[PDB]
Amino acid sequence: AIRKYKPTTPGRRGASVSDFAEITRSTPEKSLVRPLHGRGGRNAHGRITTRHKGGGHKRAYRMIDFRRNDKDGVNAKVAHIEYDPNRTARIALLHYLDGEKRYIIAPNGLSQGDVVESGANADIKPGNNLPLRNIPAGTLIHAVELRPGGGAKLARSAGSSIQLLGKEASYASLRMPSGEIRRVDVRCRATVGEVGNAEQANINWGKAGRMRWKGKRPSVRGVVMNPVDHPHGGGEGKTSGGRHPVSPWGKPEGRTRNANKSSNKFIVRRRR
RNA sequence: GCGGAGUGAUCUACCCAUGGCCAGGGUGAAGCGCGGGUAAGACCGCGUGGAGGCCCGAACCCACUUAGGUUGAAGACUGAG
RNA sequence: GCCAGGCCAGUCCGCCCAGGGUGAGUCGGGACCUAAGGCGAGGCCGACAGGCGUAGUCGAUGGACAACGGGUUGAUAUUCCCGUACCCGUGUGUGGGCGCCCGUGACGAAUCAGCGGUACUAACCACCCAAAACCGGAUCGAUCACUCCCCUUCGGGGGUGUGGAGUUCUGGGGCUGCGUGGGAACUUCGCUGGUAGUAGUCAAGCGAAGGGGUGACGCAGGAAGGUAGCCGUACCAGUCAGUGGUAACACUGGGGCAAGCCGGUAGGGAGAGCGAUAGGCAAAUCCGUCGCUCACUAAUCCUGAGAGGUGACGCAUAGCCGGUUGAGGCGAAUUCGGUGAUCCUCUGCUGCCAAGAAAAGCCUCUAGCGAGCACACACACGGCCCGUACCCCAAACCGACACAGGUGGUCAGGUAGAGCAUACCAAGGCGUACGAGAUAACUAUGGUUAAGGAACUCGGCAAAAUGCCCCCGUAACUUCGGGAGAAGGGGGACCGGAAUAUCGUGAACACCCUUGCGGUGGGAGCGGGAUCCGGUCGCAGAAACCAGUGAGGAGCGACUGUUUACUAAAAACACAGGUCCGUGCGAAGUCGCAAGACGAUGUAUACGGACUGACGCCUGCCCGGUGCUGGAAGGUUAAGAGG
RNA sequence: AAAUUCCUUGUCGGGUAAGUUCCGACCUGCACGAAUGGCGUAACGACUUCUCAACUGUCUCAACCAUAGACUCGGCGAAA
RNA sequence: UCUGAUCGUAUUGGGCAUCUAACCUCGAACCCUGAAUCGGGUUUAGGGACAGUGCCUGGCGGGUAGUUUAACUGGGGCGGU
RNA sequence: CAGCUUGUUGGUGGGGUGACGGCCUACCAAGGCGACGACGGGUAGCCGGCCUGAGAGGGUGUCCGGCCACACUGGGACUGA
RNA sequence: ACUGCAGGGGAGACUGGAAUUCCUGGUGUAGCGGUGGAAUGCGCAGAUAUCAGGAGGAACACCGGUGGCGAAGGCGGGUCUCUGGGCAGUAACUGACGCUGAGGAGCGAAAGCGUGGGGAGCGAACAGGAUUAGAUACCCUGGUAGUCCACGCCGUAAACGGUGGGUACUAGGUGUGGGUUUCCUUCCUUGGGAUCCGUGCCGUAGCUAACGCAUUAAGUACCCCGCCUGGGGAGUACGGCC
RNA sequence: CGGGCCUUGUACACACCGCCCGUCACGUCAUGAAAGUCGGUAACACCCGAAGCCAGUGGCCUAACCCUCGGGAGGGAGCUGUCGAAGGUGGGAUCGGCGAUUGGGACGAAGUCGUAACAAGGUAGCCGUACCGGAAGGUGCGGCUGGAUC
RNA sequence: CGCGGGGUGGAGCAGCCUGGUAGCUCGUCGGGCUCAUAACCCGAAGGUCGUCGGUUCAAAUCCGGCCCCCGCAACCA
Ligand SMILES: [Mg+2]
Ligand SMILES: [Mg+2]
Ligand SMILES: [Mg+2]
Ligand SMILES: [Mg+2]
Ligand SMILES: [Mg+2]
Ligand SMILES: [Mg+2]
Ligand SMILES: [Mg+2]
Ligand SMILES: [Mg+2]
Ligand SMILES: [Mg+2]
Ligand SMILES: [Mg+2]
Ligand SMILES: [Mg+2]
Ligand SMILES: [Mg+2]
Ligand SMILES: [Mg+2]
Ligand SMILES: [Mg+2]
Ligand SMILES: [Mg+2]
Ligand SMILES: [Mg+2]
Ligand SMILES: [Mg+2]
Ligand SMILES: [Mg+2]
Ligand SMILES: [Mg+2]
Ligand SMILES: [Mg+2]
Ligand SMILES: [Mg+2]
Ligand SMILES: [Mg+2]
Ligand SMILES: [Mg+2]
Ligand SMILES: [Mg+2]
Ligand SMILES: [Mg+2]
Ligand SMILES: [Mg+2]
Ligand SMILES: [Mg+2]
Ligand SMILES: [Mg+2]
Ligand SMILES: [Mg+2]
Ligand SMILES: [Mg+2]
Ligand SMILES: [Mg+2]
Ligand SMILES: [Mg+2]
Ligand SMILES: [Mg+2]
Ligand SMILES: [Mg+2]
Ligand SMILES: [Mg+2]
Ligand SMILES: [Mg+2]
Ligand SMILES: [Mg+2]
Ligand SMILES: [Mg+2]
Ligand SMILES: [Mg+2]
Ligand SMILES: [Mg+2]
Ligand SMILES: [Mg+2]
Ligand SMILES: [Mg+2]
Ligand SMILES: [Mg+2]
Ligand SMILES: [Mg+2]
Ligand SMILES: [Mg+2]
Ligand SMILES: [Mg+2]
Ligand SMILES: [Mg+2]
Ligand SMILES: [Mg+2]
Ligand SMILES: [Mg+2]
Ligand SMILES: [Mg+2]
Ligand SMILES: [Mg+2]
Ligand SMILES: [Mg+2]
Ligand SMILES: [Mg+2]
Ligand SMILES: [Mg+2]
Ligand SMILES: [Mg+2]
Ligand SMILES: [Mg+2]
Ligand SMILES: [Mg+2]
Ligand SMILES: [Mg+2]
Ligand SMILES: [Mg+2]
Ligand SMILES: [Mg+2]
Ligand SMILES: [Mg+2]
Ligand SMILES: [Mg+2]
Ligand SMILES: [Mg+2]
Ligand SMILES: [Mg+2]
Ligand SMILES: [Mg+2]
Ligand SMILES: [Mg+2]
Ligand SMILES: [Mg+2]
Ligand SMILES: [Mg+2]
Ligand SMILES: [Mg+2]
Ligand SMILES: [Mg+2]
Ligand SMILES: [Mg+2]
Ligand SMILES: [Mg+2]
Ligand SMILES: [Mg+2]
Ligand SMILES: [Mg+2]
Ligand SMILES: [Mg+2]
Ligand SMILES: [Mg+2]
Ligand SMILES: [Mg+2]
Ligand SMILES: [Mg+2]
Ligand SMILES: [Mg+2]
Ligand SMILES: [Mg+2]
Ligand SMILES: [Mg+2]
Ligand SMILES: [Mg+2]
Ligand SMILES: [Mg+2]
Ligand SMILES: [Mg+2]
Ligand SMILES: [Mg+2]
Ligand SMILES: [Mg+2]
Ligand SMILES: [Mg+2]
Ligand SMILES: [Mg+2]
Ligand SMILES: [Mg+2]
Ligand SMILES: [Mg+2]
Ligand SMILES: [Mg+2]
Ligand SMILES: [Mg+2]
Ligand SMILES: [Mg+2]
Ligand SMILES: [Mg+2]
Ligand SMILES: [Mg+2]
Ligand SMILES: [Mg+2]
Ligand SMILES: [Mg+2]
Ligand SMILES: [Mg+2]
Ligand SMILES: [Mg+2]
Ligand SMILES: [Mg+2]
Ligand SMILES: [Mg+2]
Ligand SMILES: [Mg+2]
Ligand SMILES: [Mg+2]
Ligand SMILES: [Mg+2]
Ligand SMILES: [Mg+2]
Ligand SMILES: [Mg+2]
Ligand SMILES: [Mg+2]
Ligand SMILES: [Mg+2]
Ligand SMILES: [Mg+2]
Ligand SMILES: [Mg+2]
Ligand SMILES: [Mg+2]
Ligand SMILES: [Mg+2]
Ligand SMILES: [Mg+2]
Ligand SMILES: [Mg+2]
Ligand SMILES: [Mg+2]
Ligand SMILES: [Mg+2]
Ligand SMILES: [Mg+2]
Ligand SMILES: [Mg+2]
Ligand SMILES: [Mg+2]
Ligand SMILES: [Mg+2]
Ligand SMILES: [Mg+2]
Ligand SMILES: [Mg+2]
Ligand SMILES: [Mg+2]
Ligand SMILES: [Mg+2]
Ligand SMILES: [Mg+2]
Ligand SMILES: [Mg+2]
Ligand SMILES: [Mg+2]
Ligand SMILES: [Mg+2]
Ligand SMILES: [Mg+2]
Ligand SMILES: [Mg+2]
Ligand SMILES: [Mg+2]
Ligand SMILES: [Mg+2]
Ligand SMILES: [Mg+2]
Ligand SMILES: [Mg+2]
Ligand SMILES: [Mg+2]
Ligand SMILES: [Mg+2]
Ligand SMILES: [Mg+2]
Ligand SMILES: [Mg+2]
Ligand SMILES: [Mg+2]
Ligand SMILES: [Mg+2]
Ligand SMILES: [Mg+2]
Ligand SMILES: [Mg+2]
Ligand SMILES: [Mg+2]
Ligand SMILES: [Mg+2]
Ligand SMILES: [Mg+2]
């Protein structure tokens, strides 16, 4: 699934790339495409709020359907598996029997041509979308909602899944990819299966220019700055920072979650 | 030098949208064909193909060395590399 | 014009004075469209000042949209004039065509009477249970009343059999009900006659709200087919350049012309009918989706460079006449090849990953409007605002200067050459603003140098050297790609011959045919390249200009990259790779008092921060100190409560 | 004995006619040391450093030629 | 009768649990709306007297700010005073 | 010591020799040798014989006899049966 | 070839329960743990113990053996899917198609290596305690890689029967696994006999230096292959291949 | 503590007051690596190329043969060309010697440190592998009996 | 050179600013245990407290002077 380049140049020695063997129809669906423009990590004030962003190839947004609420009982057929520059997972184009086109995140094992169902009366097969009440415990799911009707938020990256632990009264227990136990309403929805393209994390980008294409600008270590620029700056030779490590704005390392956040009631165990 | 209120990104730093430009040579990746090899394979030899922060080299962009300039042709340049 | 300016002078001038000079339906912009971004009705937020933003409206560097060739002035010309085109709108005629009322064809319901659903379901049936109650068996316990038996301190145990409230298991009736499915009607449904072909609808044209399609998009790489251009050439018109030859093809010049329209080639691209319809907020014959029949190699349609015709009975031109050297008049031939694009077919094709605007415009669908419309020809008209002179790699711009600096795009000839390098030239420009002399030292910029050859110097700094095409040949080491143009060598000019198809490109005259912009053979003329053999010349054949020095051992950084504009380009920064910490989602983090924003139209294989810095082998011990993470037994500790 | 070693031109070997630099070692580490990473490493470098071939006015040791100044004449005509 | 432990009313305080109606929701639908991912209102789905905010109060706080950091001295620094 | 070979392997026409022959040459074809050890490295004149041994074997090549090679080192031809 | 037969032979997918550890909650109070004896350690902030619920990984008690299958290494929770070999019977078919096998290729315990995941228990390294003259150990308390999974590499073991493969022949006795088979066919006995293929013990001839082997040869013979030539140096250096 | 009988293991027989392993220190011998350095051998590519054969040319010389008496034929000297030994240049291959320093090996006396193996050798031992440790070795995983147990 | 720390039994270390009494481990000697040696056990012994010169009734101790040893600094041109 990962193809390795031959060491023809210094910049392709250890590099690797997807084989793109799951991809059909290398062009997108014209009516589901909206424009994007880069922002260079600049907010509404025009200032850099996120460093190390900018440059990179031009992209077009593809409308992914994260609700899957209005087509319960209407079946769909997978037409194409396509490339998507906005996420690590591939996306599937669905032809609903009523004649509507939609993108969903392609699960693992959703070859072109398979049929896909939604609603409480759907089989437990990869690509089906059900309320959590209807999914048996011990099942791998993805694209889970945090609130009923809020859209899929959890387990959308490539290779991700959520393991449904159990349903007690009106709450389901989930083990999320980070490994922490959360509790959600059983009226939330999820798609059955694991997100595909699970091998993409083994890609070795060979050179700096390849990351510039994906839109990351170079990152300067704070220890080779001047004291005016970073708390780690200064020194005659090279140093380790003359103090305990801190952020560029002087914040020390440590937990940054709000201690009295309103969602603590839904967190069973913090990640390890 | 300190404070208050304003002016500046037509220079320069970075970013955003939209256009344009890069003579001529060389090398020969993946893939794909053919033949060999086998039970099938790996693998091998040829073709095709034209990859690459690839090579030599004008425009173009730089500024490493040296000589000249140093009340300059020029408040940072010229010649030769 | 000449007293300032111009680095001298000046009769000249980008200087000074007066007058004149810029002509657009089509060029570049607006009146058309939107991108990043700006402003922003209400709005939200903010003590005030104000911040941000929705609807909206601006905003090209992009999209859409109609003109070419010649002539003319001292100064403008795709603008004026001539010839020939194209685009939008207006009016008036002529002609046929389709419409409404009319009429007219197509479609076409609706009420009330005949059966099942047994759909509905009072009851009923099948099933299990409380199978209620109750009749009543067995199991357990220290109660317990009767009778058989016993000790005593006189109150009860045991032998306790029976039952009593009896625990439990559990036998039968299982009425009454639970539940399911069959399951009475009226009530909902459909069929036939049936209101009746009745009500009603549709059938000119426009539709711009709204739906849909298109518009609509990356980078790299060619090939094939063409054309511009360029070089020859039939043919035409001329020359004798006072030199040894040269009298006509020996030499010189010409050997032309657009948009538009016609045309449909090379090359590309495309299934069509019928039905149904949850979707495209309403609707839809459109789009989407599904199904059937046929075709599926084809036919047909679209598209499309080029060739060809017209444009052109015109314009232009070599030259010749007359010629204040100004304006004028006449004006020949114009065929066939080669080479060849950065241009065109091509918004195509192939490959790749990094996955490559929007809106208008155009087309279509219906909502709707609708009694008059659409069409052909002819004629006559309307085509608005701004720019247009001149410089524009510069003496007219940015540099205080008529300043060796800087300034985006388009075009771009010949011979040699791989080439937009380089040399010399064409078209066309220019000699640019102090000069004239003179063999001083010395400085600068170039050139040559006997013998030696780094002895110079901090240091081979600078210079010298190598350098091209073709052919042999090429090491350690290696991450198997490299190193490598390693190193080191050999050939190179001209003439003749092989050589008349030597070979390879294109392919004229002449050979068939589904007759065409067709095919096959054919090989002319015109160009390309290499070899072998023989000869000739010089000191030298890469000929001038142009054009790698190579090898070896260490250190640092893996590598390409970036940096102190103006003394530091590096061993510094970055980098792919690694590890740790944080973050469960208007997340963490950052900008903001806040709202709001970015993160991200992302979701732990993700994002932020920290350190290390390709790859290989590895990364040992210490938790005492200070941080970080967790905990809460104890000690100390604020306001508040208490008083 | 190091981009780290003061003593110090440590000592031994190699290279040179002669080597405070260079290469290989020794360990007596003033004061190396494992992600402020340790030790290596093919390729790469207008990096630093040492050696060789070729070549040369860098040098022994200079000489000559041409041009722009300098110098002379006419014009204009500053500066610290 | 320290009455230590215990009774029933008060009264209020402290946890603890539940509720919904304040309040919250960048969950959803509809309307203002003709064009609206803003805003507001209506309904619903949740959370919930918590959170957020005001006043008071303790901690932490080179993130930022204002400042201080002696003199003598056979120059100053180090030493000493 | 695992790949060696381009007059190399074969053919045709010529040349050359006392004689066949890539012995030589022009052209044509693409063969030839190799694990039964090609190519390479080490050593060595070979034999009748001699020494040993029950024999088979092992060692050896000196006197004598046969053959080969050479004549200071390398190359070349001439004269001649 | 047909018909039967036995089997932890192999691969994949799903799935079960006991137990250990941890987490949550209840009860509960001062010890637990460990040894030759102790200490380190855990706990009093509520441990060990006990009860209920949950998570997760690994190994599969009884069956179970001396027994089975596989070329060897190896193979046992269950079910399903796919798949290899063996034996017996028949004698239907082919008609010597056989054996061995230099080089070569494939498979090949464990440890180890790479990339990714997982991690209960165990446990190199490491730390503390104890013992000891010392204790880089044995014993104790912890504990990382690893052990597990996917996909590759590695190619070695006292990889052993310390016994290469094929074939024929040479007393028996006695167990056990898989068939077939008359007769005694009920003597129900699933006993006896006969025959074929395994796997053990004991024993004659024969062999052996002896120990022992002995129809499963280390006996009697034939075919092919590998290997040995005193002990060290040394399965090491150099060269090469991976 | 000592003794007796039987049985078991043994690498002991000077008979456990036995045998025996590995570092370290001193000495000797042989050998591997090493910046580099000194020799030998056989080739290869190219440059230059003597003699000589062969092939050409050959105005200079030439008795026999021919002649029309001028010469002709034929020959030679010289010259050119292929091949060509020796030599030169270059990059490799291969066989040895030395080499500061460094790795192990063997043998030495009556040196130092432990006690790994042989008995259940005092923790059964060996095999493969990995990590660790002054050293014999230890520990983990798997294996074997060439060990024990009822 | 400046500054601050040290010198105690054969060796490694306490005791010292507190002036009145020098101790611990290993070592050494003798005795046990052993065939003998280690290891183990028992009993002992051993010191001008770097020198000198001061305060003091009294100094290892307090203070100055020299001697060795160690550590930290010797900087700006
Ligand atoms: Mg702003
Ligand atoms: Mg970042
Ligand atoms: Mg960085
Ligand atoms: Mg810095
Ligand atoms: Mg700054
Ligand atoms: Mg700071
Ligand atoms: Mg710092
Ligand atoms: Mg620093
Ligand atoms: Mg430092
Ligand atoms: Mg660090
Ligand atoms: Mg100011
Ligand atoms: Mg501003
Ligand atoms: Mg190029
Ligand atoms: Mg290929
Ligand atoms: Mg490049
Ligand atoms: Mg270049
Ligand atoms: Mg430029
Ligand atoms: Mg720069
Ligand atoms: Mg200079
Ligand atoms: Mg000067
Ligand atoms: Mg310069
Ligand atoms: Mg330059
Ligand atoms: Mg004047
Ligand atoms: Mg003047
Ligand atoms: Mg307002
Ligand atoms: Mg605004
Ligand atoms: Mg806007
Ligand atoms: Mg506009
Ligand atoms: Mg524009
Ligand atoms: Mg003009
Ligand atoms: Mg006109
Ligand atoms: Mg698009
Ligand atoms: Mg072409
Ligand atoms: Mg003449
Ligand atoms: Mg002509
Ligand atoms: Mg349709
Ligand atoms: Mg035409
Ligand atoms: Mg104009
Ligand atoms: Mg003009
Ligand atoms: Mg202009
Ligand atoms: Mg100017
Ligand atoms: Mg200028
Ligand atoms: Mg040119
Ligand atoms: Mg040029
Ligand atoms: Mg010129
Ligand atoms: Mg003069
Ligand atoms: Mg010279
Ligand atoms: Mg010379
Ligand atoms: Mg030199
Ligand atoms: Mg010198
Ligand atoms: Mg000198
Ligand atoms: Mg130089
Ligand atoms: Mg030069
Ligand atoms: Mg070369
Ligand atoms: Mg090289
Ligand atoms: Mg000559
Ligand atoms: Mg070159
Ligand atoms: Mg080194
Ligand atoms: Mg150095
Ligand atoms: Mg670098
Ligand atoms: Mg490194
Ligand atoms: Mg480069
Ligand atoms: Mg600078
Ligand atoms: Mg540089
Ligand atoms: Mg510089
Ligand atoms: Mg930097
Ligand atoms: Mg936040
Ligand atoms: Mg993490
Ligand atoms: Mg960190
Ligand atoms: Mg770094
Ligand atoms: Mg990084
Ligand atoms: Mg580093
Ligand atoms: Mg570390
Ligand atoms: Mg610590
Ligand atoms: Mg700590
Ligand atoms: Mg701690
Ligand atoms: Mg804390
Ligand atoms: Mg050293
Ligand atoms: Mg150092
Ligand atoms: Mg030195
Ligand atoms: Mg030198
Ligand atoms: Mg030097
Ligand atoms: Mg050195
Ligand atoms: Mg360091
Ligand atoms: Mg570190
Ligand atoms: Mg290093
Ligand atoms: Mg660079
Ligand atoms: Mg550099
Ligand atoms: Mg003068
Ligand atoms: Mg509150
Ligand atoms: Mg509060
Ligand atoms: Mg602070
Ligand atoms: Mg401050
Ligand atoms: Mg102040
Ligand atoms: Mg002072
Ligand atoms: Mg002083
Ligand atoms: Mg030949
Ligand atoms: Mg022949
Ligand atoms: Mg010999
Ligand atoms: Mg014999
Ligand atoms: Mg000879
Ligand atoms: Mg002699
Ligand atoms: Mg000779
Ligand atoms: Mg004779
Ligand atoms: Mg002869
Ligand atoms: Mg498996
Ligand atoms: Mg656990
Ligand atoms: Mg508990
Ligand atoms: Mg418990
Ligand atoms: Mg037969
Ligand atoms: Mg075999
Ligand atoms: Mg074999
Ligand atoms: Mg294998
Ligand atoms: Mg393993
Ligand atoms: Mg592993
Ligand atoms: Mg490891
Ligand atoms: Mg792993
Ligand atoms: Mg354990
Ligand atoms: Mg342990
Ligand atoms: Mg320990
Ligand atoms: Mg073996
Ligand atoms: Mg085994
Ligand atoms: Mg063996
Ligand atoms: Mg056998
Ligand atoms: Mg046998
Ligand atoms: Mg048997
Ligand atoms: Mg024997
Ligand atoms: Mg036996
Ligand atoms: Mg035997
Ligand atoms: Mg070995
Ligand atoms: Mg080796
Ligand atoms: Mg007796
Ligand atoms: Mg014995
Ligand atoms: Mg020795
Ligand atoms: Mg050696
Ligand atoms: Mg000759
Ligand atoms: Mg040596
Ligand atoms: Mg042992
Ligand atoms: Mg022992
Ligand atoms: Mg022991
Ligand atoms: Mg033992
Ligand atoms: Mg250990
Ligand atoms: Mg072991
Ligand atoms: Mg074991
Ligand atoms: Mg300094």
Residue numbers in the entry: 2 to 273
From the paper:
Here, we report the discovery of a series of macrolides called sequanamycins with outstanding in vitro and in vivo activity against Mycobacterium tuberculosis (Mtb). Sequanamycins are bacterial ribosome inhibitors that interact with the ribosome in a similar manner to classic macrolides like erythromycin and clarithromycin, but with binding characteristics that allow them to overcome the inherent macrolide resistance of Mtb. Members of the sequanamycin family bind in the same pocket of the ribosome as erythromycin. Like other macrolides, the sequanamycins bind in a narrow part of the peptide exit tunnel at a site that lies between the peptidyl transferase center and a constriction in the tunnel that occludes the lumen, near ribosomal proteins L4 and L22.
